[PDB]
Design an enzyme around this catalytic site. Structure first.
Site, PDB file in Angstrom:
ATOM      1  N   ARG A  56       0.844  -1.197   0.000  1.00 34.16           N
ATOM      2  CA  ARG A  56       0.000   0.000   0.000  1.00 34.16           C
ATOM      3  C   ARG A  56       0.871   1.235   0.000  1.00 34.16           C
ATOM      4  NH1 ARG A  56      -4.984   1.596   3.490  1.00 34.16           N
ATOM      5  NH2 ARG A  56      -4.810   3.103   1.764  1.00 34.16           N
ATOM      6  N   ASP A 114      -3.059  -1.185   8.653  1.00 35.71           N
ATOM      7  CA  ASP A 114      -2.110  -0.240   9.220  1.00 35.71           C
ATOM      8  C   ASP A 114      -1.453  -0.786  10.484  1.00 35.71           C
ATOM      9  OD1 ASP A 114      -3.990   2.890   8.726  1.00 35.71           O
ATOM     10  OD2 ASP A 114      -2.822   1.709   7.294  1.00 35.71           O
ATOM     11  N   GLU A 141      -3.919  14.205   5.768  1.00 34.93           N
ATOM     12  CA  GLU A 141      -2.921  14.035   4.712  1.00 34.93           C
ATOM     13  C   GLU A 141      -3.039  15.162   3.706  1.00 34.93           C
ATOM     14  OE1 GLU A 141      -3.166   9.144   4.936  1.00 34.93           O
ATOM     15  OE2 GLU A 141      -4.405  10.316   3.531  1.00 34.93           O
ATOM     16  N   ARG A 169      -6.719  16.398   2.539  1.00 30.12           N
ATOM     17  CA  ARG A 169      -7.757  15.477   2.964  1.00 30.12           C
ATOM     18  C   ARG A 169      -8.470  16.060   4.189  1.00 30.12           C
ATOM     19  NH1 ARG A 169      -6.691   8.998   4.414  1.00 30.12           N
ATOM     20  NH2 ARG A 169      -8.542   8.742   5.751  1.00 30.12           N
TER      21      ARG A 169
END
Ligand SMILES: [Ca+2]
Length: 448
Positions: free
Chosen positions: A24, A49, A297, A313
């Site tokens: 990712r 994550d 982000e 974001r």
């Protein structure tokens, strides 16, 4: 159309590549020499994550404009479910040094449970990494030698990878779940560099002491790329997007930057600092206690006069854009909401394009154009000065004149680069955590 180019997607990373099951978080950058560097999370235990994984950083290079790629290499790898997560790429034009930065967590730690502060302690004017035993006793690492709270040398030493040595014999690693001395459980910003066009990389430097404040819980790289300022009083400044949480867990974007070719770094204010909300109220990133104004982000681009634009974001459903007149040190109080660009709470990519399009300076933008992570769309935004601020500075907005669907179905994180031939390369999450896809497009295609 005729002469339009959109290459068939190539799985630049995929299960099995470098013996990693999952991948990712793409970053993609063309160096001064014309080489493409692609970095990514090699997520070894599934796609989740940190802390629910063991994630290493991988890199591939292409010397032929993205047509063929090397066999890859792992450049950071910590043991026992300590992870490096979320990479970003930039290069200093002056020295040619390429930087890759990444967020690092010790085993068991991630965004939600990160402890406060940098994890360093100042002793007599220098910052030293702290270590803790299981009782909570605090030690410091001074030139890789472990000292106790009273300033006495212990039998322990470390290395840059976190290995822990007792009388010169390795016994564990300070980032593992089992070490008798551990780094503080929190986020760290790591920096590595390459002086040979990406072939070899340094060991990580932990720069938390320069960029993380005492009141920050999480501070992480916002993945993708950075910039080096081209115009105005901050020409040469290297700017790297980040974001952080305060004590209440609320997220705010910022940039870290270096004026000395990457040797020293500092963090600027967030656009949430002294931000004026739609309701007229003023907030600050230190005190923000509500979810709605969070800025997370982000990626940054430069306007014709040097002004910075931070694309972020956020939770509004649409793109948010902040403006800095001082090279990223502070941001104007107004965060623009551009309702022409959906933002379904996902990372985005935006880059400057090197030549004018339709007589205007332009940026290229990539994100999922939907209320979900789908309908992956690349846009050309033409820059227009629409007025001035009260301080006399130019006010710039974007005309999203061309908007091209490039990936039907799933589309999440992405990263753009301009190629040597003037075309656009794109590395994107077209699957949740499996195949990461690379394509090249020309302007004929994007404008079609
Ligand atoms: Ca690892």
């Amino acid at each position: 159309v005729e002469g339009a180019v959109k290459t068939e997607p190539v799985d630049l990373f995929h299960p099995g590549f470098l013996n990693s099951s999952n991948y990712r978080i793409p970053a993609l950058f063309k160096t001064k020499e014309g080489t493409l560097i692609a970095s990514i999370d090699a997520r070894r235990q599934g796609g989740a994550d940190a802390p629910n994984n063991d994630i290493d950083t991988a890199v591939r290079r292409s010397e032929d404009g993205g047509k063929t790629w090397d066999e890859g290499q792992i450049i950071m790898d910590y043991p026992d479910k300590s992870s490096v997560i979320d990479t970003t790429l930039i290069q200093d034009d002056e020295t040619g040094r390429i930087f890759l930065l990444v967020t690092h967590f010790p085993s068991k730690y991630g965004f939600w449970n990160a402890g406060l502060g940098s994890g360093f302690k100042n002793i007599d004017g220098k910052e030293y990494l702290c270590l803790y035993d299981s009782s909570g006793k605090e030690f410091t690492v001074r030139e890789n030698v472990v000292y106790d709270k009273d300033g006495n040398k212990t039998e322990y030493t470390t290395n840059a990878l976190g290995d822990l040595f007792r009388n010169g014999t390795k016994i564990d690693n300070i980032n593992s779940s089992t070490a008798p001395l551990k780094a503080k459980g929190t986020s760290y910003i790591n920096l590595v560099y390459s002086d040979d066009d990406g072939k070899t990389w340094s060991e990580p430097q932990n720069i938390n002491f320069q960029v993380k404040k005492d009141w920050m819980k999480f501070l992480g790289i916002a993945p993708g790329r950075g910039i080096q300022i081209k115009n105005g009083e901050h020409k040469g400044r290297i700017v790297v997007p980040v974001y952080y949480t305060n004590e209440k867990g609320k997220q705010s974007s910022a940039v870290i930057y270096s004026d000395d070719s990457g040797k020293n770094w500092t963090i600027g204010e967030s656009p949430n600092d002294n931000r004026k909300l739609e309701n007229g109220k003023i907030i600050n990133s230190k005190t923000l206690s509500d979810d709605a104004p969070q800025l997370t982000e982000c990626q940054v681009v430069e306007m014709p006069n040097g002004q910075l634009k931070l694309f972020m974001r956020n939770l509004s459903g649409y793109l948010n854009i902040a403006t800095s007149f001082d090279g990223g040190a502070t941001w104007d109080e107004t965060v623009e909401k551009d309702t022409n660009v959906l933002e379904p709470y996902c990372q985005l990519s935006v880059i400057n394009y090197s030549q004018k399009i339709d007589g205007k300076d332009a940026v290229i933008f990539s994100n999922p154009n939907a209320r979900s992570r789908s309908n992956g769309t690349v846009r050309i935004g033409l820059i227009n000065q629409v007025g001035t601020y009260e301080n006399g500075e130019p006010k710039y907005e974007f005309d999203w004149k061309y908007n091209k669907l490039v990936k039907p179905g799933y589309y999440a994180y992405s990263c753009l680069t301009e190629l040597s031939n003037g075309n656009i390369g794109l590395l994107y999450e077209g699957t949740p955590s499996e195949e990461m896809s690379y394509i090249e497009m020309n302007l004929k295609y994007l404008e079609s």
